[PDB]
């Protein structure tokens, strides 16, 4: 663990620019070479030539419901094995941290599954688990999307105590998506953020003012913008209006997820959001359990999903269930659709989600002191290799 | 001639030049802006007259490409003296900072066009009022589903004989500068080509067209969008519609698509002005879309074949909650655009002048304070209230003070 690694002949993403600069690593952390040189030595124990390729912080996916046959919203015999399988497979997508996401389920499912998915550091076993993202059940009936109507719930009884009874202990929970128009959402948002949980707005028929109120109550994220929310209207902007709002707490950057799989939103939607509020854009996969399996029928929590073509509908409906697009595919599609810089596309998949979760000192950057989680990319942003804590954990067949 | 004409120098002023407010004098001769360094170099001449501007802002005079009348005048009426109504509006809008405009006619029966269109030719600006750049004919070749305030009974389509139907409806087009149409109408391609071949700007509006149909119309020659967001399908993330033109990457290279916005605080909320301005700032054109009741306050009035009731600060088609147009003068729109978007003063001023000038290919003579341009400009205080209006270097309106 004490070895000094030096990555040379590389362009690194630092401060929003690709710099021709070496990356120094020891004990899983990025090192300041000026400080290393003065205090210790100048010669690394190992040099690795990167052939001019790009090193960028490892991707962070804060919304993924499963994959490769695994459905996080199922109380199976070995919940942990399913999480570890997905965590391992998404290394090949450039993902080094993620939030396993559960969808609207009966309380007993939460009680069995939630304690089985704790935080875990990344390594050769797979991407690190940052905590659970619980999407629903405290969401709107009118914008339930693929969530089962039977298991939706409201707050009005006794607000946060109803949420605690539904989910069970929240120690392992990092994010909760809710619809803020629900009665007593204010109390719930306050109680959740007081416990360090990120509150996201989604699956909601709330208007702009209600959404702005929820941000003042503590909300900091929007769940897959444009999907499962009222559209933008010029005399009724809705939640999309948060991207241009000047009525939020001063200095606060509202973050918002976008599914850039080429099916959930057209290029115009990616462009208009990126141009209105670039700093807040967070790429998420919202991947469903059928990710990586091709066509067929599989599950998503309590619902059944029909995948045919590159599109996943709730069976018997034309309601999209989620994406089958890996994160690296989303990064490239975002880049192509918006014409943004490579730096901007890479930041939306790593820096921005890290900032959302308050992790920007340890994840999402190649800054001094941060964890050495990074991907090796060619100029087309195809992932050649994935590193966690300075250790090679995935390498492309080529 | 240059040798014989007087040199006027405006001093103690900030001027809008190259997108920046510069503490720099404005020099004028023969009605056009001159380079002082070159004048001294080639002629060793200084100003024959200096005018101290008290530290105020000089900006190119506003250009309003969509105004249906004002102060009781309705351009879409075949009245006894159509020209007198145009001159009245042209004079009054000098106090709004407007030095050029396009009188706009709404969906009307052919007989109205045949009588009115020939009575409203281009006319240079002066003490008589803002210059008339030509007519803007909005409708009748627009969709029924997004007709907005236009009367259903007088809508028309192209399918019969395309451009010859348009020519028979409007009459001779010599005086016409802009036509708004809905591009999903059958045979719109042929009409767009024939209109642009005659130098007429084609605008897209009052339409249920989708993005690809809108992009096709730009490839055929269309260069404007009529009051973005109003009377068109809303933006959807899997169906962008006409708003999607603001972010399209498949339009002709190097050419800017322009779009009008009514920044009166009633037609669109601040988020809509912000999202458009951030997506495509260079294309934004402020238009008043002013109705004949502009400057009259509440009451009942006309808009072509329709009746309009102004109540509160809102002008509805009588008996409906359908907005007919605005009662906001251009300078009011400029100040509201500035406030609602938080943009720079320069950006607000450019949206009311530079951009409409570029739309109409007039950027070398209007909409700028560049050397060689016409000396049409407004004197503004720091809040962008109009204190005085100049045309061809001559003072043509001044605030009471
Ligand atoms: N996970 C969400 C679904 O819940 C939603 O149904 C779908 C389509 O949303 P929309 O039709 O509102 O764009 O997007 C995502 O997949
Ligand atoms: N001149 C147009 C009207 O024709 C239209 O009805 C109005 C409202 O349009 P919308 O309700 O689609 O925003 O905008 C402008 O006023
Ligand atoms: Zn969702
Ligand atoms: Zn109109």
Residue numbers in the entry:
A (entry chain B): 9 to 406
B (entry chain A): 6 to 406
Paper text:
Optimized crystals diffracted to a resolution limit of 1.84 Å (AMDHD2+Zn) or 1.90 Å (AMDHD2+Zn+GlcN6P). A superposition of the Zn-bound and the GlcN6P- and Zn-bound structures of AMDHD2 indicated no structural changes by the binding of the product. Residues from both monomers contribute to GlcN6P-binding. The phosphate group of the sugar is interacting via hydrogen bonds with Asn235 and Ala236, as well as ionic interactions to His242* and Arg243* of the other monomer. GlcN6P binding to the active site is further mediated by hydrogen bonds between the hydroxyl groups of GlcN6P with Ala154 and His272. The catalytic Zn ion is coordinated via electrostatic interactions with Glu143, His211, His232, and two water molecules, which in turn are stabilized by interactions with GlcN6P and several amino acid side chains including Asp294 that might, based on the homology to bacterial NagA, act as the catalytic base. Residues from both monomers contribute to ligand binding in the active site, while the residues important for catalysis originate from one monomer. To assess a functional role of the residues His242* and Arg243*, and especially of the dimeric state on catalytic activity of AMDHD2, we generated the double mutant H242A/R243A and the mutants I280E and I280R, whose side chains might disrupt dimerization. Strikingly, I280E, I280R, andH242A/R243A showed no catalytic activity, supporting that AMDHD2 must form a dimer to be active and that the residues His242* and Arg243* are indispensable for catalytic activity.
AMDHD2 is an amidohydrolase that plays a potential role in the HBP by catalyzing the deacetylation of GlcNAc-6P in the ‘reverse’ direction of the pathway. Human AMDHD2 is organized into two domains, a deacetylase domain responsible for the conversion of GlcNAc-6P into GlcN6P and a second small domain with unknown function (DUF). The structure of the deacetylase domain showed a TIM (triosephosphate isomerase) barrel-like fold. In summary, our data show that human AMDHD2 is an obligate dimeric protein with high specificity for GlcNAc-6P that carries a single catalytic Zn ion in the active center.
